[PDB]
Design an enzyme around this catalytic site. Structure first.
Site, PDB file in Angstrom:
ATOM      1  CG  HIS A  48     -12.769  50.371 -12.408  1.00  0.00           C
ATOM      2  ND1 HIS A  48     -11.847  50.247 -11.392  1.00  0.00           N
ATOM      3  CD2 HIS A  48     -12.069  50.279 -13.564  1.00  0.00           C
ATOM      4  CE1 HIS A  48     -10.642  50.086 -11.909  1.00  0.00           C
ATOM      5  NE2 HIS A  48     -10.749  50.102 -13.225  1.00  0.00           N
ATOM      6  CD  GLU A  76      -4.503  35.740 -22.170  1.00  0.00           C
ATOM      7  OE1 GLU A  76      -5.090  36.316 -21.229  1.00  0.00           O
ATOM      8  OE2 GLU A  76      -4.712  36.011 -23.371  1.00  0.00           O
ATOM      9  CG  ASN A 107       1.906  36.660 -25.543  1.00  0.00           C
ATOM     10  OD1 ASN A 107       1.142  36.999 -26.446  1.00  0.00           O
ATOM     11  ND2 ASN A 107       2.979  37.368 -25.209  1.00  0.00           N
ATOM     12  CB  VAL A 125       1.459  34.289 -28.366  1.00  0.00           C
ATOM     13  CG1 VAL A 125       1.868  32.908 -28.855  1.00  0.00           C
ATOM     14  CG2 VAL A 125       2.081  35.374 -29.233  1.00  0.00           C
ATOM     15  CD  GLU A 179      -4.167  29.793 -23.822  1.00  0.00           C
ATOM     16  OE1 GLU A 179      -2.992  29.666 -23.417  1.00  0.00           O
ATOM     17  OE2 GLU A 179      -4.517  29.519 -24.989  1.00  0.00           O
ATOM     18  CG  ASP A 191     -12.259  50.233  -8.194  1.00  0.00           C
ATOM     19  OD1 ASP A 191     -13.218  49.550  -8.607  1.00  0.00           O
ATOM     20  OD2 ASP A 191     -11.427  50.768  -8.957  1.00  0.00           O
ATOM     21  N   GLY A 237      -1.229  50.664 -14.674  1.00  0.00           N
ATOM     22  CA  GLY A 237      -2.634  50.465 -14.380  1.00  0.00           C
ATOM     23  C   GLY A 237      -3.085  49.022 -14.463  1.00  0.00           C
ATOM     24  CB  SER A 273      -8.280  48.492 -14.711  1.00  0.00           C
ATOM     25  OG  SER A 273      -7.992  49.754 -15.286  1.00  0.00           O
ATOM     26  N   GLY A 274      -6.809  46.464 -11.955  1.00  0.00           N
ATOM     27  CA  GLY A 274      -7.085  45.280 -11.167  1.00  0.00           C
ATOM     28  C   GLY A 274      -5.937  44.296 -11.094  1.00  0.00           C
TER      29      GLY A 274
END
Ligand SMILES: *[C@@H]1O[C@H](CO)[C@@H](O[C@@H]2O[C@H](CO)[C@@H](O[C@@H]3O[C@H](CO)[C@@H](O)[C@H](O[C@H]4O[C@H](CO)[C@@H](O)[C@H](O)[C@@H]4O)[C@@H]3O)[C@H](O)[C@H]2NC(C)=O)[C@H](O)[C@H]1NC(C)=O
Ligand SMILES: *[C@@H]1O[C@H](CO)[C@@H](O[C@@H]2O[C@H](CO)[C@@H](O[C@@H]3O[C@H](CO[C@H]4O[C@H](CO)[C@@H](O)[C@H](O)[C@@H]4O)[C@@H](O)[C@H](O)[C@@H]3O)[C@H](O)[C@H]2NC(C)=O)[C@H](O)[C@H]1NC(C)=O
Ligand SMILES: *[C@@H]1O[C@H](CO)[C@@H](O[C@@H]2O[C@H](CO[C@@H]3O[C@H](CO)[C@@H](O)[C@H](O[C@H]4O[C@H](CO)[C@@H](O)[C@H](O)[C@@H]4O)[C@@H]3O)[C@@H](O)[C@H](O)[C@H]2NC(C)=O)[C@H](O)[C@H]1NC(C)=O
Ligand SMILES: *[C@@H]1O[C@H](CO)[C@@H](O[C@@H]2O[C@H](CO)[C@@H](O[C@@H]3O[C@H](CO)[C@@H](O)[C@H](O)[C@@H]3O)[C@H](O)[C@H]2NC(C)=O)[C@H](O)[C@H]1NC(C)=O
Ligand SMILES: *[C@@H]1O[C@H](CO)[C@@H](O[C@@H]2O[C@H](CO)[C@@H](O[C@@H]3O[C@H](CO)[C@@H](O)[C@H](O)[C@@H]3O)[C@H](O)[C@H]2NC(C)=O)[C@H](O)[C@H]1NC(C)=O
Ligand SMILES: *[C@@H]1O[C@H](CO[C@@H]2O[C@H](CO)[C@@H](O[C@@H]3O[C@H](CO)[C@@H](O)[C@H](O)[C@@H]3O)[C@H](O)[C@H]2NC(C)=O)[C@@H](O)[C@H](O)[C@H]1NC(C)=O
Ligand SMILES: *[C@@H]1O[C@H](CO[C@@H]2O[C@H](CO)[C@@H](O[C@@H]3O[C@H](CO)[C@@H](O)[C@H](O)[C@@H]3O)[C@H](O)[C@H]2NC(C)=O)[C@@H](O)[C@H](O)[C@H]1NC(C)=O
Ligand SMILES: *[C@@H]1O[C@H](CO[C@@H]2O[C@H](CO)[C@@H](O[C@@H]3O[C@H](CO)[C@@H](O)[C@H](O)[C@@H]3O)[C@H](O)[C@H]2NC(C)=O)[C@@H](O)[C@H](O)[C@H]1NC(C)=O
Ligand SMILES: *[C@@H]1O[C@H](CO[C@@H]2O[C@H](CO[C@@H]3O[C@H](CO)[C@@H](O)[C@H](O)[C@@H]3O)[C@@H](O)[C@H](O)[C@H]2NC(C)=O)[C@@H](O)[C@H](O)[C@H]1NC(C)=O
Ligand SMILES: *[C@@H]1O[C@H](CO)[C@@H](O[C@@H]2O[C@H](CO)[C@@H](O)[C@H](O)[C@H]2NC(C)=O)[C@H](O)[C@H]1NC(C)=O
Ligand SMILES: *[C@@H]1O[C@H](CO)[C@@H](O)[C@H](O)[C@H]1NC(C)=O
Ligand SMILES: *[C@@H]1O[C@H](CO)[C@@H](O)[C@H](O)[C@H]1NC(C)=O
Ligand SMILES: *[C@@H]1O[C@H](CO)[C@@H](O)[C@H](O)[C@H]1NC(C)=O
Lengths: 235, 603, 232
Positions: free
Chosen positions: C48, C60, C62, C65, C70, C92, C183, C185-186
């Site tokens: 989603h 990454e 932070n 920061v 990264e 999903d 969450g 989301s992933g």
């Protein structure tokens, strides 16, 4: 933590880092060939599985660990001081066992416990160590952080810090004007004084109200009264 | 005439303009070549400037799969002051394509419209210039992309009823998204992403096949502003009634307000809602009264996730508002914050009461638990607390056992995590059990029998002498301070050599315990190596100079001898009369002397 | 105003995900979703999170920061599951293709494709920018690695009656709005050192009762391989 300074290479051979699951969380002092003394608060609740604690003696930077100057060891037994209560965060002293034996070298050196009837005068400016951060909301520094702070008497610390009981079981060290502090963060370093080229263990750092906050010195755990308890396991 | 890299000339090759400025919508070349149909190779249909009031346009390769990513752009131009209506019949595509519809040209092409994976139906633009861009970002031949028709109609002949009435089943009707907003009201057919917030169905149709508008469904981590601005409404001799349906279901629903903007710059907002009202469409009815032209603004400050707000079935009816057929919305109930504190804990436990759980083992224990058990028994007894089941959490809560008999309790054991735990014994008849848990992750708990006894944790001793170590192993003479380890605790090497009549750890007379009797050490065979060995056995430092002072033991004193195995030979033979006894003089241990680079501040 | 971390306490979680190469973030001007890098140019994430343009940040340390370790990669193509349902967020899971091959370093690497389904009680780690704060739900600048066992399939179905299928497994347990998986989301869900799933949805930010829902990746191993072969 604001105010700290990077320690020199090998300037603190008596500080050993502790890793739980692969992340540095706390520090300890080398008291003998098979024991380490660290803060009980930073290791409380994780003593049931000593195998997850890895002690890196002679640790300077987290960039590398497979060096002769660094001694890796696996903790087998963890002893928590009975007088620790976790309510007032007093008597936060714990001991860990370094397998069977540990040698000594230039980068791996022991520590000195306080002698009998030894009293640290107030205002005495003593050194503290630990792998602190550049700021509270920042990333932990890769270089060992050292600082120099003056001691504060318990009677004056009660007036200056009416937030914790503190009492005589622990000693306040820091600046009444703030600026320099290293208690916060993942430092875990010990407070060390000077005794004419003899590095006596003044105490073990503990919880701090706020880094570099004026009239809020770091309330480190006093170890002068706990010297006998440590020597009981050492001897 | 040549142009710098990154820019191209016009048809007349007289002016150089940026490549991104070609076919953007604003005339840059003096002859208008940047907007010319031939210069802007649309490929889709070969037409770029749609000066006509109506027509049709199709995407790339109408009868063929779009194997090549071709970007198409069209500009629809009509008479000034007239609106343009775009009708879309099919937009069922497997994404990878972007359809952007923008009102006007130039700086106005920011966030006018963005529709993907859903048929937009009818979209009305209130400007003489409309920009339609079909962008293909990859060589995907799944679908052509769309095929639409457009017409034109007057923008001001509409009355107040038509300009406001909208079921949102065929687009946004006549509403125009505010360009000052940080985002736009997305059009969704059916339930949205991130469930447990926002509507799950369309109000107009009653099922998922309908279309409505709401806040963006993406998991935005920043607060934004969205708003719908209505068309100006001509004054009427009778106040009107505005009716709408609003769905506000979410934990972080910040605000939703209705404002009126007029030529007098006076706002008298009559509708404002905040918080969660439930997963149901609520009916909002208000009365509008004004003497001049005004615009109705629906504003919403969108917070982080779980802050979805939707609007549907908005209409305006001439006449005074009638009796509302729906009640005012009710806020979603929340857990009571009236001093949650803790669970208090059970009462004191005694001998008859043995079996106990935290609060209720089978289900769970309340959050923020601080259960205290005061385990007491008869004087002279000790407490054993063996746990049948221990299935606590990780580093969140921990069961602590404190030794009693005094206010300064002594910690005995801290237990946490799943799995059985070992038994714990107390040194007195009073024990304190503390259940220190946070407000989250409350598992079933623990359960123990709480038995009592006498010296339960003490290892069983042996009668008739049979000297025992700390673990209790019988070592009368096999491991009596001779360098041999048999005891599990390793206490067979206890300190059988000490100092007596000393004012410190490095003063006095050295005494050795051969088997059970302490005897002093003479100076008959005292050497530097023996001094160092005595220092090592007493836990001391370097073997500095030491001389005898005066004897105290005139009996069978212990004579010291050197051995190749590193252990001093002790001879309990009195080979001399009134021999002076060696006084212990050893230095401090070789501690952490400052051999490092640490500096000392001379202040 | 005393600080929360008065003592040498990191909150009980691996802050900033030190030595964690399998965690990557999706940015399009803000942090919205996480993902797991499975191949040199393949990222598994929540289905989603699709949008017009996606940027992938690898290693990454932070979010607020920039430590310099990264890497930023422009995503090429995002493919969702053909049986993905918007209403119930079933299946999903989506795959993002990187326009450039990932550079292997200390904090950037690829995690091996799973070969075994998750099991109840397995020591599993949930990685992501979980809500770690004294009070309230907000995304902090640090990262959270929660050690939570995988719940049973029957318990997972009972947590969401009618909202759990054969491709959904539960790792969150009990209830609570404080520091948890939350969450993101992933958020990657890796058990026994192998990627096992992603965070799909849940009952809000673990407000009460059921914490959240995790979508498996073992059931899509054939689908992942087919997508990689077709979009190599
Ligand atoms: C969801 O809720 C809606 C709300 O009513 C519900 O109704 C459906 O609406 C759609 C369109 O809105 C209907 O589809 C068309 O509606 C037009 C309206 O005039 C009809 O004329 C169409 O029928 C034509 O085609 C038929 C083909 O044989 C001819 O026989 C007929 O004479 C017409 O020429 C067409 O139906 C749809 O029919 C209604 N549905 C119902 C049951 O009324 C919709 O059903 C709901 N969806 C669900 C529950 O899945
Ligand atoms: C062991 O666990 C028990 C489980 O809760 C503790 O509760 C005890 O349970 C027994 C059995 O019901 C109670 O005995 C009752 O006593 C009342 C009369 O006492 C009441 O009135 C007097 C004043 O006259 C008052 O002082 C008491 O507190 C009571 O309110 C009878 O009418 C009943 O029929 C029954 O026999 C105990 O009273 C109750 N004790 C409590 C609640 O403190 C028990 O205390 C535990 N044992 C310990 C701690 O030693
Ligand atoms: C819909 O209409 C309503 C009108 O009821 C709009 O409400 C807005 O309300 C604010 C009131 O908040 C405060 O009003 C002060 C004047 O009384 C104003 O001075 C404040 O600004 C600053 O004030 C001091 C001094 O500068 C500063 O220290 C504060 O920190 C503060 O920042 C503050 O705004 C009113 O001022 C607005 O004018 C009014 N908006 C209007 C009338 O348009 C509501 O926003 C409207 N909703 C919309 C437009 O979406
Ligand atoms: C730590 O320091 C010691 C010396 O201080 C290093 O050498 C070790 O010294 C011991 C003591 O002599 C040796 O034990 C001896 O081994 C011989 C057989 O080689 C045996 O015949 C003797 O009876 C005695 O047991 C030991 O072998 C020797 N080497 C080791 C332990 O590897 C030691 O290497 C240092 N350790 C580290 C990790 O630096
Ligand atoms: C498109 O619609 C607009 C509607 O605004 C038409 O313009 C004219 O707009 C006025 C309102 O400003 C309408 O009302 C008239 O106002 C004048 C005062 O300016 C007043 O004297 C009249 O009695 C009347 O009330 C006017 O009817 C309207 N003209 C129309 C509808 O012909 C515009 O003309 C429309 N476009 C086309 C091509 O017709
Ligand atoms: C939108 O509502 C407007 C409401 O304003 C009211 O207007 C009436 C007259 O229209 C005022 O009544 C007057 O009151 C005076 C005393 O203050 C009397 O002397 C006078 O005879 C008359 O009765 C009323 O006071 C006023 N309200 C306030 C609070 O002042 C109305 O004026 C607009 O016409 C209306 N717009 C429409 C219907 O399109
Ligand atoms: C037995 O111990 C002897 C140690 O005696 C004392 O050792 C200290 C060192 O900690 C000397 O302090 C030094 O004194 C110097 C001046 O003499 C200073 O310049 C220096 O900075 C430091 O303070 C101290 O003087 C010394 N005392 C005396 C009376 O010399 C040691 O010297 C012996 O070697 C040792 N072994 C034997 C067999 O005697
Ligand atoms: C306890 O920590 C100390 C922090 O250092 C102090 O910082 C002040 C800043 O003003 C220095 O002040 C200067 O001091 C000069 C004399 O030393 C003055 O002439 C000058 O005007 C200014 O006042 C100060 O010197 C500096 N240290 C001290 C105490 O002088 C640290 O330096 C301390 O040494 C450490 N405390 C102790 C016991 O010394
Ligand atoms: C309450 O405490 C029980 C303790 O378990 C108890 O174990 C007893 C031992 O059985 C004997 O074993 C001898 C040597 O094997 C054998 O010769 C003899 O014949 C017996 O079999 C047993 O007799 C008790 O029944 C048993 N207690 C219970 C209640 O079953 C512990 O298991 C339990 O978890 C404790 N309760 C709680 C709530 O923790
Ligand atoms: C914590 O500090 C308080 C004072 O801030 C202590 O309370 C005093 O206790 C002494 C003896 O215990 C009494 O004589 C005083 O009257 C108390 N009140 C004061 C000084 O205001 C308290 O005892 C301290 N806690 C501990 C464990 O010692
Ligand atoms: C390890 O890191 C330290 C940090 O400065 C560096 O000096 C050293 O060269 C590195 N390598 C080894 C083998 O110690
Ligand atoms: C409202 O009341 C008026 C006057 O009684 C009536 O004519 C009208 O039908 C009612 N309903 C609506 C929707 O206006
Ligand atoms: C040493 O102390 C003991 C006390 O147990 C005493 O009996 C003995 O006489 C003392 N020896 C001296 C003072 O020489």
């Amino acid at each position: 933590i604001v105010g700290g300074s990077n320690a020199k290479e090998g300037a603190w051979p008596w500080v050993v880092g502790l890793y739980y699951g692969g992340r540095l969380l706390c520090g300890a002092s080398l008291v003998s060939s098979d024991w380490l003394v660290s803060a009980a608060a930073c290791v409380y609740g994780r003593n049931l599985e000593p195998s997850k604690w890895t002690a890196i003696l002679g640790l300077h930077m987290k960039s590398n660990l497979t060096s002769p100057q660094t001694v890796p060891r696996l903790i087998d037994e963890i002893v928590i001081n009975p007088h620790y209560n976790r309510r007032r965060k007093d008597n936060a002293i714990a001991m860990m066992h370094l397998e069977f034996k540990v040698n000594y070298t230039d980068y791996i050196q022991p520590i000195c416990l306080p002698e009998e009837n030894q009293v640290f005068p107030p205002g005495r400016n003593c050194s503290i160590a630990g792998w602190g951060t550049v700021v509270y909301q920042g990333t932990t520094a890769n270089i060992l952080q050292e600082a120099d702070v003056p001691l504060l008497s318990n009677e004056r610390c009660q007036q200056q810090m009416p937030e914790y009981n503190i009492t005589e079981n622990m000693i306040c060290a820091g600046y009444e004007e703030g600026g320099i502090d290293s208690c916060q963060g993942d430092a875990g370093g010990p407070l060390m004084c000077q005794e004419n080229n003899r590095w006596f263990l003044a105490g073990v750092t503990s919880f701090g109200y706020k880094c570099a906050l004026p009239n809020r010195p770091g309330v480190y755990a006093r170890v002068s009264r706990f010297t006998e308890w440590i020597q009981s396991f050492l001897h | 005439i040549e142009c710098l890299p990154g820019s191209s000339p016009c048809t007349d090759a007289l002016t150089c303009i940026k490549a991104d400025l070609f076919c953007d919508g604003e005339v840059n070349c003096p002859d208008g070549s940047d907007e010319d149909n031939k210069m802007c190779a649309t490929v889709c249909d070969g037409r770029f400037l749609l000066t006509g009031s109506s027509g049709s346009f199709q995407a790339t390769h109408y009868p063929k799969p779009s194997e090549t990513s071709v970007v198409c752009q069209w500009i629809i131009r009509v008479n000034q002051g007239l609106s343009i209506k775009l009708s879309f019949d099919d937009f069922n595509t497997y994404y990878t394509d972007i359809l952007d519809i923008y009102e006007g040209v130039g700086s106005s092409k920011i966030l006018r419209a963005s529709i993907w994976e859903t048929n937009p139906g009818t979209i009305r633009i209130f400007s003489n210039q409309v920009t339609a861009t079909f962008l293909i970002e990859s060589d995907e031949s799944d679908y052509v992309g769309f095929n639409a028709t457009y017409t034109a109609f007057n923008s001001s002949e509409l009355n107040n009823y038509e300009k406001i009435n909208c079921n949102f089943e065929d687009g946004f009707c006549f509403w125009v998204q505010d360009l000052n907003d940080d985002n736009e009201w997305e059009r969704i057919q059916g339930s949205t992403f991130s469930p447990f917030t926002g509507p799950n169905f369309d109000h107009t149709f009653g099922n998922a096949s309908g279309f409505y508008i709401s806040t963006p469904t993406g998991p935005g981590g920043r607060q934004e502003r969205v708003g719908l601005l209505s068309l100006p409404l001509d004054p009427t001799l009778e106040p009107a009634c505005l009716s709408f349906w609003y769905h506000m279901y979410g934990e972080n629903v910040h605000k939703l307000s209705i404002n009126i903007s007029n030529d007098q710059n006076m706002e008298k907002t009559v509708f404002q809602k905040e918080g969660n009202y439930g997963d149901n469409w609520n009916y909002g009815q208000v009365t509008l009264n004004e003497t001049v032209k005004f615009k109705v603004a629906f504003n919403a400050f969108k917070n982080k996730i779980l802050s979805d707000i939707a609007l549907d079935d908005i209409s305006l009816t001439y006449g005074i508002c009638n009796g509302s057929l729906y009640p005012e919305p009710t806020l979603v109930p929340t857990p009571p914050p009236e001093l949650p504190t803790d669970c208090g804990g059970p009462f004191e436990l005694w001998e008859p009461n043995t079996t106990f759980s935290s609060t209720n083992f089978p289900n769970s224990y309340p959050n923020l638990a601080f259960c205290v058990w005061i385990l007491n028994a008869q004087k002279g007894k000790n407490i054993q607390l063996h746990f049948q089941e221990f299935d606590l959490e990780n580093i969140n809560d921990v069961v602590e056992i404190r030794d009693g008999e005094e206010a300064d309790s002594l910690l005995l054991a801290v237990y946490t995590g799943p799995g059985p735990v070992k038994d714990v014994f107390s040194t007195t008849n009073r024990m304190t059990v503390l259940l220190i848990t946070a407000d989250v992750l409350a598992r079933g708990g623990f359960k123990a029998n709480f038995t009592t006894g006498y010296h339960l944790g003490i290892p069983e001793p042996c009668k008739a002498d049979h000297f025992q170590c700390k673990n209790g192993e019988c070592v009368p003479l096999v491991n009596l301070c001779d360098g041999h380890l048999h005891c599990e605790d390793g206490s067979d090497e206890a300190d059988c050599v000490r100092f007596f009549n000393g004012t410190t750890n490095n003063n006095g007379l050295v005494r050795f315990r051969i088997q059970s009797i302490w005897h002093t050490a003479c100076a008959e065979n005292w050497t530097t190596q023996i001094s160092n060995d005595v220092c090592q056995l007493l836990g001391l430092g370097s073997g500095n100079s030491s001389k005898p002072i005066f004897p105290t033991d005139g009996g069978p004193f212990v004579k010291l001898n050197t051995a190749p195995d590193g252990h001093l030979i002790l001879t309990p033979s009195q080979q001399c009369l009134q021999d002076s006894l060696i006084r212990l003089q050893c230095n401090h241990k070789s501690c952490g002397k400052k051999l490092a680079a640490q500096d000392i501040t001379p202040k | 105003a005393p600080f929360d971390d008065d003592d040498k306490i990191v909150g009980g979680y691996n802050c900033e995900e030190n030595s964690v190469p399998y965690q990557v973030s999706l940015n399009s001007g803000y942090h919205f979703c996480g993902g797991s890098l499975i191949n040199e140019q393949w990222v598994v994430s929540a289905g989603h999170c699709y949008k017009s343009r996606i940027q992938v940040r690898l290693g990454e340390h932070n979010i607020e920061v920039l430590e310099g370790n990264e890497q930023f990669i422009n995503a090429a193509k995002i493919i969702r599951h053909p049986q993905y349902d918007r209403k119930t967020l079933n299946n999903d899971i989506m795959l993002i293709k990187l326009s450039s091959r990932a550079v292997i370093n200390a904090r950037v690497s690829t995690i091996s494709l799973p070969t075994a389904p998750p099991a109840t009680g397995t020591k599993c780690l949930i990685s992501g920018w979980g809500n770690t704060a004294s009070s309230g739900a907000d995304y902090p600048d640090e990262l959270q690695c929660l050690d939570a066992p995988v719940l049973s399939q029957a318990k997972c179905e009972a947590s969401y009656p009618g909202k759990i299928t054969s491709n959904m497994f539960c790792v969150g347990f009990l209830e609570g709005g404080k520091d948890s998986c939350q969450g993101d989301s992933g958020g990657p869900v890796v058990c026994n050192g192998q990627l096992q799933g992603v965070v799909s949805w849940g009952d809000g930010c673990a407000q009460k009762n059921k914490p959240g829902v995790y979508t498996k990746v073992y059931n899509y191993v054939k689908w992942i391989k087919n997508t990689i072969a077709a979009n190599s």
